[PDB]
PDB file of C-alpha atoms and ligand atoms in Angstrom:
ATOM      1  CA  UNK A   4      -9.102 -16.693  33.908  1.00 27.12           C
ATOM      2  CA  UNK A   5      -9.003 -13.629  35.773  1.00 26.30           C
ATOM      3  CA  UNK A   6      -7.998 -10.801  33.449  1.00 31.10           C
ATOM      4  CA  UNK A   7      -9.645 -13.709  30.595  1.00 29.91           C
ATOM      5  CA  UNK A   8     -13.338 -12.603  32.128  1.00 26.25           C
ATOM      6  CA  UNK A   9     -12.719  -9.415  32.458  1.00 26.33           C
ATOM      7  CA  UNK A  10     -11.484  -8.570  28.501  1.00 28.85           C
ATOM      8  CA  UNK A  11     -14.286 -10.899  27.644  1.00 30.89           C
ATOM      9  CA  UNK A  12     -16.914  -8.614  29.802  1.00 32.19           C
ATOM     10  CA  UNK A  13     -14.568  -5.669  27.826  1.00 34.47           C
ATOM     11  CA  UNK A  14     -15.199  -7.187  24.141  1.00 31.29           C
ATOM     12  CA  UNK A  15     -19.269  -8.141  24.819  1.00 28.60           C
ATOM     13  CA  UNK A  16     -19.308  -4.371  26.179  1.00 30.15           C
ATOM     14  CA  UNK A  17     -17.366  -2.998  22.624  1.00 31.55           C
ATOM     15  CA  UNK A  18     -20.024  -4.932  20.548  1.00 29.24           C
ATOM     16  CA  UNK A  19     -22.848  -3.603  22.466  1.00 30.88           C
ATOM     17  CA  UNK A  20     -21.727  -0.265  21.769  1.00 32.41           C
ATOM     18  CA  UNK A  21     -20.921  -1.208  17.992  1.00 31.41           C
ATOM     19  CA  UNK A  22     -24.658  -2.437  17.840  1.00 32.88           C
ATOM     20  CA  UNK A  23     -26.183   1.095  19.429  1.00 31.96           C
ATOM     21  CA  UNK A  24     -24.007   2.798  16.864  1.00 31.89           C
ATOM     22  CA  UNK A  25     -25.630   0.201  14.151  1.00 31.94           C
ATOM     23  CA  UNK A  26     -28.871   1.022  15.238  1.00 34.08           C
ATOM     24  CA  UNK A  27     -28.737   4.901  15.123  1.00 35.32           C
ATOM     25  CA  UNK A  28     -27.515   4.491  11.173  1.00 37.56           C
ATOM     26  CA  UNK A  29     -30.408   2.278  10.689  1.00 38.77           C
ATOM     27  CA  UNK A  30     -33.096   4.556  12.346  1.00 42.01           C
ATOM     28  CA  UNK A  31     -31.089   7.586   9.977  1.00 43.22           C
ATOM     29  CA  UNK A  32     -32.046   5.875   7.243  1.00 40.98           C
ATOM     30  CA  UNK A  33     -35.244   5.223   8.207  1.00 40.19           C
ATOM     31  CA  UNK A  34     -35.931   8.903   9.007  1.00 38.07           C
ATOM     32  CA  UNK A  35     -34.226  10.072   5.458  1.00 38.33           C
ATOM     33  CA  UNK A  36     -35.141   8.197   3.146  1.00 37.56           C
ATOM     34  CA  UNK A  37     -39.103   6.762   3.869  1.00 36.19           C
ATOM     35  CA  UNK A  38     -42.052   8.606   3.392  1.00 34.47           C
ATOM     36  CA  UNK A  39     -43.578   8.170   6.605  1.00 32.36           C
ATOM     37  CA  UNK A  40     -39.613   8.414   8.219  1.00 29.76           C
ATOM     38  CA  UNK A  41     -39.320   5.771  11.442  1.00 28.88           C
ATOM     39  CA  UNK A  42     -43.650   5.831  11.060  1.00 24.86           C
ATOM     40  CA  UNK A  43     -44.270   2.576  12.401  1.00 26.30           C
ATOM     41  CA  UNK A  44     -40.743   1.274  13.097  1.00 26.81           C
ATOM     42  CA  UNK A  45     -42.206   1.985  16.928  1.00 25.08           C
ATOM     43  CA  UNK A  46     -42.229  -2.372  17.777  1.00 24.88           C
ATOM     44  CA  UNK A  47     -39.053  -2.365  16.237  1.00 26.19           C
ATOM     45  CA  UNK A  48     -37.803  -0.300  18.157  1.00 25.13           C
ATOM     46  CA  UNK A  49     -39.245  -1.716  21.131  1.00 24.38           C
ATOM     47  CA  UNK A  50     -37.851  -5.024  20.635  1.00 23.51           C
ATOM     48  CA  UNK A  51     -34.468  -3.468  20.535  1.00 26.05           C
ATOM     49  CA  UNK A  52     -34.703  -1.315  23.587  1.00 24.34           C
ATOM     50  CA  UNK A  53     -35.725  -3.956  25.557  1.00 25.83           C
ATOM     51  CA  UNK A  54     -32.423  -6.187  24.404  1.00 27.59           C
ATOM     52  CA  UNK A  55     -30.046  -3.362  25.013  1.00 25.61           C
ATOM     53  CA  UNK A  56     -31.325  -3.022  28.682  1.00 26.17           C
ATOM     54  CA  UNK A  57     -30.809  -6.448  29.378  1.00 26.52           C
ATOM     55  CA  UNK A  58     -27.264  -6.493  27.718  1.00 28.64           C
ATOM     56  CA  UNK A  59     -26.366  -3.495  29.706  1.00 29.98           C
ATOM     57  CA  UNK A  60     -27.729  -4.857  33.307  1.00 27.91           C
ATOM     58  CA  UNK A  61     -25.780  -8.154  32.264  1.00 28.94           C
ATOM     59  CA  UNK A  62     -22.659  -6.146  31.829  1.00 28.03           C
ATOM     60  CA  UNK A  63     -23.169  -4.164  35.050  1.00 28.68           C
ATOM     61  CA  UNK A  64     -23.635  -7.723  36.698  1.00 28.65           C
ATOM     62  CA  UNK A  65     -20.829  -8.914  35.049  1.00 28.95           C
ATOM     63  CA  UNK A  66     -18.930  -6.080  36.265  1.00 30.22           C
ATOM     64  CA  UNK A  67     -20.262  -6.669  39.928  1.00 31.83           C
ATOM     65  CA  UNK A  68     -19.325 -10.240  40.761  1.00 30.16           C
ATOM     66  CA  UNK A  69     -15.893  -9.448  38.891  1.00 30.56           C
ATOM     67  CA  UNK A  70     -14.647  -6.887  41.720  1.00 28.71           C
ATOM     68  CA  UNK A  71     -16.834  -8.868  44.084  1.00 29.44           C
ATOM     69  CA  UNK A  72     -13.723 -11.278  43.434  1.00 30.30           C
ATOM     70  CA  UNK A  73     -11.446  -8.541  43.090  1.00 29.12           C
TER      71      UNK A  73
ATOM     72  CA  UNK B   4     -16.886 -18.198  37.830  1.00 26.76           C
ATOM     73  CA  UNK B   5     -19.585 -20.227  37.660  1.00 29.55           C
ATOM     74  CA  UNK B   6     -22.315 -17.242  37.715  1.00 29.84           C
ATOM     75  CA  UNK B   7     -19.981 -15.264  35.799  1.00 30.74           C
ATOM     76  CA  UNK B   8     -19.945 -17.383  32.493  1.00 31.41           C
ATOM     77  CA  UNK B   9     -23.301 -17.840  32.318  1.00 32.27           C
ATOM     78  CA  UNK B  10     -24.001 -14.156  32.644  1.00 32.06           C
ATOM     79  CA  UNK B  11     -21.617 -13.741  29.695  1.00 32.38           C
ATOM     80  CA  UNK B  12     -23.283 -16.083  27.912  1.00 30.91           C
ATOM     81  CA  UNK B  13     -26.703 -14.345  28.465  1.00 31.98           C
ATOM     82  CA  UNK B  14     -24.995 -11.470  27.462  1.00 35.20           C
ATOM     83  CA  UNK B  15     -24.116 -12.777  24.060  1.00 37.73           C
ATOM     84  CA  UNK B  16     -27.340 -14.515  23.370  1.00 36.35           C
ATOM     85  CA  UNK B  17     -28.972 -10.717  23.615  1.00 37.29           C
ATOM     86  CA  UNK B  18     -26.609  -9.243  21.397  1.00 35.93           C
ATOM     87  CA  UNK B  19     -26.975 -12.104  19.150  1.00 38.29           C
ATOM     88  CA  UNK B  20     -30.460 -11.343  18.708  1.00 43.57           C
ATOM     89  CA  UNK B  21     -29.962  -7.666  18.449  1.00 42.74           C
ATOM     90  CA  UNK B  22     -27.698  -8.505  16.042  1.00 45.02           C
ATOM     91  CA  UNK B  23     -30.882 -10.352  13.706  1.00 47.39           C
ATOM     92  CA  UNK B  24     -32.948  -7.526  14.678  1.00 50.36           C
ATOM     93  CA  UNK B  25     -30.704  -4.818  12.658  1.00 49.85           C
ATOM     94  CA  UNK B  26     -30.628  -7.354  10.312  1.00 52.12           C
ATOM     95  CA  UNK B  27     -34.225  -7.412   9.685  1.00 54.40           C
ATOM     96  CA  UNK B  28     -33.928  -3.707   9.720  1.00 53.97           C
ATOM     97  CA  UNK B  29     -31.660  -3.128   6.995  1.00 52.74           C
ATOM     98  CA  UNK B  30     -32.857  -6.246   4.886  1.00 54.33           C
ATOM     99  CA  UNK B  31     -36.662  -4.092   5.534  1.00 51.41           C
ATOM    100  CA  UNK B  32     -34.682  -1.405   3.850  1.00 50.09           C
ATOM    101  CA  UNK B  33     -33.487  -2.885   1.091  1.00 49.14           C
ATOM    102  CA  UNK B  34     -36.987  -4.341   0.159  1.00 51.54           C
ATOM    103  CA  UNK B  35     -38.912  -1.172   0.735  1.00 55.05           C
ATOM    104  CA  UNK B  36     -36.844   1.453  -0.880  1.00 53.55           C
ATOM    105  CA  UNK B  37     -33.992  -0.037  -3.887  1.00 53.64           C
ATOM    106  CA  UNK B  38     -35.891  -0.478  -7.060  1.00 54.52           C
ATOM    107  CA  UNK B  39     -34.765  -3.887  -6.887  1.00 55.48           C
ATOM    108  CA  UNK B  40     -35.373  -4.569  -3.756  1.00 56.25           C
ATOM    109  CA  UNK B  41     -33.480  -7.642  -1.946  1.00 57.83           C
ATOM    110  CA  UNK B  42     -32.311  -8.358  -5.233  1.00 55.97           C
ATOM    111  CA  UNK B  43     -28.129  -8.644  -5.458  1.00 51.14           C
ATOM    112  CA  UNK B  44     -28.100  -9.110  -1.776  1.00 49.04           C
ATOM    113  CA  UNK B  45     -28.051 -12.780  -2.002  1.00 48.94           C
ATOM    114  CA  UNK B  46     -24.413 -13.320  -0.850  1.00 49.55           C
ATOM    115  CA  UNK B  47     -24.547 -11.034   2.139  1.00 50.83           C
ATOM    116  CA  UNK B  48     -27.331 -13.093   3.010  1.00 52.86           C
ATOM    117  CA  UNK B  49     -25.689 -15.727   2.596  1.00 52.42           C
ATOM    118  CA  UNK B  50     -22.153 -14.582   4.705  1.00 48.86           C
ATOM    119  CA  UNK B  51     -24.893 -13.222   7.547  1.00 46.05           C
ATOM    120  CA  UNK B  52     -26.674 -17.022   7.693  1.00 49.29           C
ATOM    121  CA  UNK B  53     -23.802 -18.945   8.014  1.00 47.00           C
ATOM    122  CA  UNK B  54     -22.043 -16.908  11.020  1.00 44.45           C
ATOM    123  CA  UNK B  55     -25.829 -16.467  12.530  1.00 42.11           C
ATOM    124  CA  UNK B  56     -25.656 -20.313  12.753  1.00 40.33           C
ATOM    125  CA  UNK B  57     -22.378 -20.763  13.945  1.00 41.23           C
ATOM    126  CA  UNK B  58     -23.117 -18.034  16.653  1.00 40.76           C
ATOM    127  CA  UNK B  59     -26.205 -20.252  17.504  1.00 41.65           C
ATOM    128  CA  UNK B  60     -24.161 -23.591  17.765  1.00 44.42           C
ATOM    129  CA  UNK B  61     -21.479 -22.011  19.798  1.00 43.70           C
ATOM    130  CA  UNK B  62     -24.234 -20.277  22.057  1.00 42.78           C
ATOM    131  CA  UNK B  63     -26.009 -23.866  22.788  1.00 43.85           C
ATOM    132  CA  UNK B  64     -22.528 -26.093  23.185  1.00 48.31           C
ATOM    133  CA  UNK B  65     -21.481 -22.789  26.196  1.00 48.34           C
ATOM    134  CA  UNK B  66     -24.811 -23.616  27.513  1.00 43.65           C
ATOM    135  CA  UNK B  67     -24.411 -27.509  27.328  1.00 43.30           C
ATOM    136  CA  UNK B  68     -21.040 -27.140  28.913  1.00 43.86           C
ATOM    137  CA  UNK B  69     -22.172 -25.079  31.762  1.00 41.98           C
ATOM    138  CA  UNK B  70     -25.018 -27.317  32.957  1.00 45.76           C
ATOM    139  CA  UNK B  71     -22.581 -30.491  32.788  1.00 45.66           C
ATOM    140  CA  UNK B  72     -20.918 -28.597  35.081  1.00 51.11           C
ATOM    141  CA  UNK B  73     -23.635 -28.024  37.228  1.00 51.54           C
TER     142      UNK B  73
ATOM    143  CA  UNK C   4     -13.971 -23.820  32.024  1.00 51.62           C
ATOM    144  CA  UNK C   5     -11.228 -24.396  29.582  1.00 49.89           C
ATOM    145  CA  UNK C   6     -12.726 -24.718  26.309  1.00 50.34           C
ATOM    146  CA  UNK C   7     -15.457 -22.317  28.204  1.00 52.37           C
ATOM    147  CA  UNK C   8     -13.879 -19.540  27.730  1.00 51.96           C
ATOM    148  CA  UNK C   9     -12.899 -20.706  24.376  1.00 50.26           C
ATOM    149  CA  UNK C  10     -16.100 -21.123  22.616  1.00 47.60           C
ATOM    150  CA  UNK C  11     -17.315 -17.829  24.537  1.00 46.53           C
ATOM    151  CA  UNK C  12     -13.996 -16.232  22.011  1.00 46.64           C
ATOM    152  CA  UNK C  13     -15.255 -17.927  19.313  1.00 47.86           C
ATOM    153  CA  UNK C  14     -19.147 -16.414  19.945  1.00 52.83           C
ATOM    154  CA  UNK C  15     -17.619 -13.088  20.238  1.00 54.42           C
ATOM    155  CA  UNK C  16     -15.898 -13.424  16.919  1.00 53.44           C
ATOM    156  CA  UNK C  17     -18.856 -14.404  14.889  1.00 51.90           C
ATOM    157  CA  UNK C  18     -20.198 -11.497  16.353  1.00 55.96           C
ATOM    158  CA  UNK C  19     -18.118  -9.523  15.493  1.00 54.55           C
ATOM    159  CA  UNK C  20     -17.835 -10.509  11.948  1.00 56.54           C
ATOM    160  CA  UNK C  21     -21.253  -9.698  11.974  1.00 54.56           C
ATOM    161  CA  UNK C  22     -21.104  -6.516  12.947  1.00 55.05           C
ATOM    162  CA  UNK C  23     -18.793  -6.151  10.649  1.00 54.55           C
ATOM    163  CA  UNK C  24     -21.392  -7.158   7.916  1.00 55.61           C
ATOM    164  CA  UNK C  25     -23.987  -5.272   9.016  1.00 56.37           C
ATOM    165  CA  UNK C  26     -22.040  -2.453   8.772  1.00 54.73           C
ATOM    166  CA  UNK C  27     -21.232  -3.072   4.939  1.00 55.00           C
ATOM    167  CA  UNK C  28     -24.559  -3.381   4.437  1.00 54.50           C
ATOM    168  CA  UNK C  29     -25.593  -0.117   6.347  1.00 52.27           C
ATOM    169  CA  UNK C  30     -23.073   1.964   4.505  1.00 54.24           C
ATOM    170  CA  UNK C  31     -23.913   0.616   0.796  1.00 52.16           C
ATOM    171  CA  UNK C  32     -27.550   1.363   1.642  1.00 53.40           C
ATOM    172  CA  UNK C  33     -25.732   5.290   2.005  1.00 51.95           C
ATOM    173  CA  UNK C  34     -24.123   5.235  -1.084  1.00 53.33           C
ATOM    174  CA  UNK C  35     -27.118   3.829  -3.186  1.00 52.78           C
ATOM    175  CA  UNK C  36     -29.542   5.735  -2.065  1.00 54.08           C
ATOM    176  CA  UNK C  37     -29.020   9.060  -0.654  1.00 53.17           C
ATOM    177  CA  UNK C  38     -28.183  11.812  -2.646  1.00 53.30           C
ATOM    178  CA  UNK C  39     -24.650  12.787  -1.597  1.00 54.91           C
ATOM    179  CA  UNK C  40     -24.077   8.833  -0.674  1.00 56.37           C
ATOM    180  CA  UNK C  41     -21.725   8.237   2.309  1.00 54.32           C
ATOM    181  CA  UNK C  42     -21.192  11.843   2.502  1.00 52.99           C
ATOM    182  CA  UNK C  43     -21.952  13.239   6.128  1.00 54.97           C
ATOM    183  CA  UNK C  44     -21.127  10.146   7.937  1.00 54.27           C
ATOM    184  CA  UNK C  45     -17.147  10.446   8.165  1.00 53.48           C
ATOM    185  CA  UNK C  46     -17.706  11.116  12.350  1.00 56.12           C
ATOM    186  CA  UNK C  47     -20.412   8.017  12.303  1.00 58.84           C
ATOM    187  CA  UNK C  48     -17.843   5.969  10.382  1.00 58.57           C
ATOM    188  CA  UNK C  49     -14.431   7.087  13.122  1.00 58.85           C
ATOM    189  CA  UNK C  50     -16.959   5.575  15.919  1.00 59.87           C
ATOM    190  CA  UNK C  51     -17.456   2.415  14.152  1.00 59.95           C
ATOM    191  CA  UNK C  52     -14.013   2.160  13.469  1.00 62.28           C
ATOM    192  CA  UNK C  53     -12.329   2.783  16.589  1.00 60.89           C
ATOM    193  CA  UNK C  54     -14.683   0.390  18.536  1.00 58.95           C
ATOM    194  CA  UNK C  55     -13.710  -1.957  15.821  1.00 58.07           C
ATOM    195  CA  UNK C  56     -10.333  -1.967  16.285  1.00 53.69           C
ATOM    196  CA  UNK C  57     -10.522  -1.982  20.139  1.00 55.42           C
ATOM    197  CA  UNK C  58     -12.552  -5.137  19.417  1.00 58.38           C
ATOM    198  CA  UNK C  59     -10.117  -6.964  17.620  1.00 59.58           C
ATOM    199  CA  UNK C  60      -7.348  -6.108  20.021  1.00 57.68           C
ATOM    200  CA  UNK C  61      -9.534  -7.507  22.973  1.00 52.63           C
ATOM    201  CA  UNK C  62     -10.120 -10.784  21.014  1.00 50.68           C
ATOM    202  CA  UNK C  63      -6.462 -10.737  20.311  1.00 52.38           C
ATOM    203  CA  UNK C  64      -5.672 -10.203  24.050  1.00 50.96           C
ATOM    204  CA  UNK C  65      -7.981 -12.856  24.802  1.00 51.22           C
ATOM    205  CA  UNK C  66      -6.267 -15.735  22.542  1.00 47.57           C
ATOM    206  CA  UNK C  67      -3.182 -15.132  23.551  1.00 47.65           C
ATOM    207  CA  UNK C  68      -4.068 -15.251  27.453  1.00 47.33           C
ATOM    208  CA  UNK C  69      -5.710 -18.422  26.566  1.00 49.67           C
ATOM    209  CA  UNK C  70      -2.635 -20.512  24.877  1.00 46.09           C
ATOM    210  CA  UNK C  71      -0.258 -18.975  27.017  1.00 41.73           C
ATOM    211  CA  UNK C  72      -2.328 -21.515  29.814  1.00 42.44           C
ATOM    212  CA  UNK C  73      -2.319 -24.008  27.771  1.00 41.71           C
TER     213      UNK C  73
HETATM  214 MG1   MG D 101     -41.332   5.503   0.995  1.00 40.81          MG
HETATM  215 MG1   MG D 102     -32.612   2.055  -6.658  1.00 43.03          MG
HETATM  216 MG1   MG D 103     -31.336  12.219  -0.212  1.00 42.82          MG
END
């Protein structure tokens, strides 16, 4: 349950990076293909920055209390 | 171990939700720019419901877990 | 803690999986509507890929640690 938290904390960190990557293709297309490009995408976008910062201060606490054991 | 699981679990809940906002991106895309809009795209809704829910399910029975716990 | 750490797996998965779907969906939006399709995104699609596959392995890593307790 030791090294189990830790590739856990590992995985959740691959996914979040996964999702960034997800989220630059999206705001590509946006910025190719529309009219108006990421015009009033800006709440959107928003929305999403403000779950990525939680995710990552999550993961840095996540990281903390593991080495904290450590 | 007891602050640690619930971080992970707050950790997944955010990328869960980042996860439906890309999805509302790209379905957003789909409507606004193929001729036929959503149309065709009604099995890869269908795939991206069902694992949404059972994401959501495994999400609340962590958090029900935990707080029997506690 | 025990069937914690399994349903946290089993989150992680889904998620997965939909990542996985969203990507699908994000690269047949590339081929249908921009003019030279996928073409461009090889270095986009390596990223994806290799965080993929660490992702799997991780998920791996983590069922086995888990049987091998029980
Ligand atoms: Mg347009
Ligand atoms: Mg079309
Ligand atoms: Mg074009």
């Amino acid at each position: 349950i030791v090294q189990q938290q830790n590739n856990l904390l590992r995985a959740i960190e691959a996914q979040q990076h996964l999702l960034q990557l997800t989220v630059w293709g999206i705001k590509q297309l946006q910025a190719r293909i529309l009219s108006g490009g990421r015009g009033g995408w800006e709440e959107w976008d928003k929305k999403i920055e403000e779950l990525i910062k939680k995710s990552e201060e999550l993961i840095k606490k996540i990281e903390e209390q593991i080495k904290k054991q450590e």
